[PDB]
Amino acid sequence: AIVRAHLKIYGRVQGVGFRWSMQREARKLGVNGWVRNLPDGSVEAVLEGDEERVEALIGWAHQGPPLARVTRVEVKWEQPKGEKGFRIVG
Amino acid sequence: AIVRAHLKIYGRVQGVGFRWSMQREARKLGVNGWVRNLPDGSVEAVLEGDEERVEALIGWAHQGPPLARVTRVEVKWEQPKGEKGFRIVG
């Protein structure tokens, strides 16, 4: 089924290629939505698509690119909106 | 690569079949390790195996079984210890 996960991702998650790498993995997996940096040092993301693909990307997000250190991911499941493609928005 | 993820999972995550369902999903994915309930109401787990399979199970754990309501997951990456099977241990 199609699902939509809204994430807030904490740790050493800025300045490490996290947005570029998340975008790469999203496009590999066919996940739609977006990712952005927030001023408090966290990363925010919306992931929408087939639940197995969304789950694969969420699991990836706890590893991140090599220099990332993800200490927690907060998740809210939402009603799918019809996201198409994955992009970096901030 | 082979990885080991040590999880704490928070939310409405006890009394919902989280341990049994995690074990079923781990066995499907070929992930070894264990899962248990903690007295603070969280679920703790160790997930060990191929990185893609481990990540799939980490992502699944943000959804859980149908009646779970996960709010956050924390992962610590660890050195593989040669876990065999996936056990419910508490």
Tokens of A14: 């800025």
CA A70 to the chain's CA centroid: 12
- Provide CB contacts within 8 A for B58, sequence distance 6+: A58, A59, A62, B5, B7, B47, B73, B75
Q: Do B62 and A60 touch (CB under 8 A)?
A: no
The CATH number, out of the four listed (3.30.420.130, 3.30.70.100, 3.40.50.300, 1.50.10.20), of the domain defined by the range A1-90 = 3.30.70.100
Rounded to whole angstroms, the Cα distance separating A52 from A12 reads: 26
Tell me the chain B residues in contact with residue A56 when contact means C-beta distances shorter than 8 Å. Answer: 52, 55-56, 59
Phi, psi of B26 (to 5 degrees): -60, -45
CA torsion through residues B63, B67, B73, B77, sign: negative
Q: Residue A88: helix, strand or coil by DSSP?
A: strand
* Strand segments (E) across A1-89: 2-12, 32-37, 43-50, 69-78, 86-88
Q: Which 3-state string (H, E, C) describes chain B?
A: CEEEEEEEEEEECCCCCHHHHHHHHHHHHCCEEEEEECCCCCEEEEEEEEHHHHHHHHHHCCCCCCCCEEEEEEEEEECCCCCCCEEECC
A23 φ/ψ sector (left φ>0, alpha ψ -120 to 50, else beta): alpha
Beta pairing partners, B76? B6
Q: Long-range CB contacts (< 8 A, 24+ apart) of A79-83?
A: A79/A4, A80/A2, A80/A3, A80/A4, A80/A48, A81/A4, A81/A48, A83/A4, A83/A32, A83/A33, A83/A34, A83/A46, A83/A48, A83/A49
Q: Which helix (DSSP H) or strand (DSSP E) does residue A24 occupy?
A: helix A18-29
Q: Is B32 a catalytic residue?
A: no
Nearest to B11 by CA among A36, A74, A51: A74
Instruction: Give residue ranges of B with CB < 8 Å to any A CB.
Output: 3, 5, 51-52, 54-60, 62-63, 70-75, 77
Rounded to whole angstroms, the Cα distance separating B59 from B62 reads: 5
Q: Which helix (DSSP H) or strand (DSSP E) does residue A61 occupy?
A: helix A51-63
Q: Any idea where the domains of chain A sit in the sequence?
A: 1-90
Instruction: Say how many C-beta atoms besides its own lie within 10 A of residue B64's C-beta.
Output: 21
- Chain B: residue whose CA lies nearest to A70: B75
| Distance (Å) of CA B77 to CA B48, B50, B67 | 10, 13, 28
What does the DSSP 8-state code read for residue A19?
Answer: H
Would you say B56 and B7 are in contact if contact means Cβ atoms under 8 Å apart?
A: no
Q: Do A73 and B72 touch (CB under 8 A)?
A: yes
| Distance (Å) of CA B3 to CA A33, A87, B7, B36, B75 | 28, 29, 13, 20, 12
